[PDB]
Amino acid sequence: LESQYQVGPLLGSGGFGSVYSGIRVSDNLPVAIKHVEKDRISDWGELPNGTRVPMEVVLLKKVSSGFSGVIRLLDWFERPDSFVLILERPEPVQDLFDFITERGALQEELARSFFWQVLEAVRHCHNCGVLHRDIKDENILIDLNRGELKLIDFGSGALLKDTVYTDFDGTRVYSPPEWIRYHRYHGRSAAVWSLGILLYDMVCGDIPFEHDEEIIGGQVFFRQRVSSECQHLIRWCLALRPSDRPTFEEIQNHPWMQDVLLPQETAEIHLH
Numbered sequence: 001l002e003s004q005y006q007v008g009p010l011l012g013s014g015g016f017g018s019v020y021s022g023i024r025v026s027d028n029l030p031v032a033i034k035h036v037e038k039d040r041i042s043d044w045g046e047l048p049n050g051t052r053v054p055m056e057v058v059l060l061k062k063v064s065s066g067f068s069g070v071i072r073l074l075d076w077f078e079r080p081d082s083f084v085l086i087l088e089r090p091e092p093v094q095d096l097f098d099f100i101t102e103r104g105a106l107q108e109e110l111a112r113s114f115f116w117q118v119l120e121a122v123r124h125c126h127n128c129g130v131l132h133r134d135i136k137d138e139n140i141l142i143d144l145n146r147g148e149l150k151l152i153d154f155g156s157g158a159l160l161k162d163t164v165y166t167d168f169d170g171t172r173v174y175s176p177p178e179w180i181r182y183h184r185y186h187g188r189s190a191a192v193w194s195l196g197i198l199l200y201d202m203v204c205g206d207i208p209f210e211h212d213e214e215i216i217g218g219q220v221f222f223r224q225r226v227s228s229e230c231q232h233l234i235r236w237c238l239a240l241r242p243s244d245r246p247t248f249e250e251i252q253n254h255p256w257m258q259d260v261l262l263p264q265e266t267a268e269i270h271l272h
């Protein structure tokens, strides 16, 4: 490790863990090094070769094959009492929370581009057999030069299945009403809820629900000017009955999702 990567300062230590900035010696590639104690890992899994690792590592490996809108796992290590994860690091970079906080609600054209990229990245995960379970602004990075959104933190993920989930260790204010009322949910439909929350956030500059009475209420009030169509989609994604929510297909053929800008154009138009 220490001769191959050189550890720099500390990036964050919110939900993901203790993540530091690194530079890989061989080619000066920017990376992010995440450490995790073994004592604090609540959730284990096995690799293809049947090694016992953190689920995070398991899920990361599955999604890291191929180019996608997901930060890729490049390497990883086991130590006596921790595991170390080497990850991509865009530069310059900023998460979607800070972006929104600095700049207010995003214009619709921008939100569309971003939201699409999120959608696309999430479909990738599902195709790969992985359910993120913690989709939110804090877990989305923006390469500010390329206009590319990347998805992060598989610390609450799970293998994607078509049966019910009884556990959930994600974000409460992003969690759907089926979890609030019944501590039961299915992956995709839950995932769609969070994208409704996410979309709202982008266009309103804030999440729509603070409390549970609000969540299970299923009334969206818009604090900002949002087009009639974008509201329609948001309200659809946040439909109380899981079965009444759209599918990823249905979302991306929604009128509001049409004529998306390229990532590059988005950068030129909204980031430079």
Ligand SMILES: O=C(Nc1[nH]nc2cc(-c3ccc(O)cc3)ccc12)C1CC1
Pocket (backbone or CB within 6 Å): 011, 012, 016, 019, 031, 032, 034, 056, 060, 071, 087, 088, 089, 090, 093, 094, 095, 141, 151, 152, 153, 154, 155
């Ligand atoms: O997010 C920033 N830099 C970063 N670059 N790459 C990261 C990967 C991760 C990361 C952490 C856990 C995981 O399962 C997958 C990816 C976190 C942060 C990363 C910051 C604050 C501006």
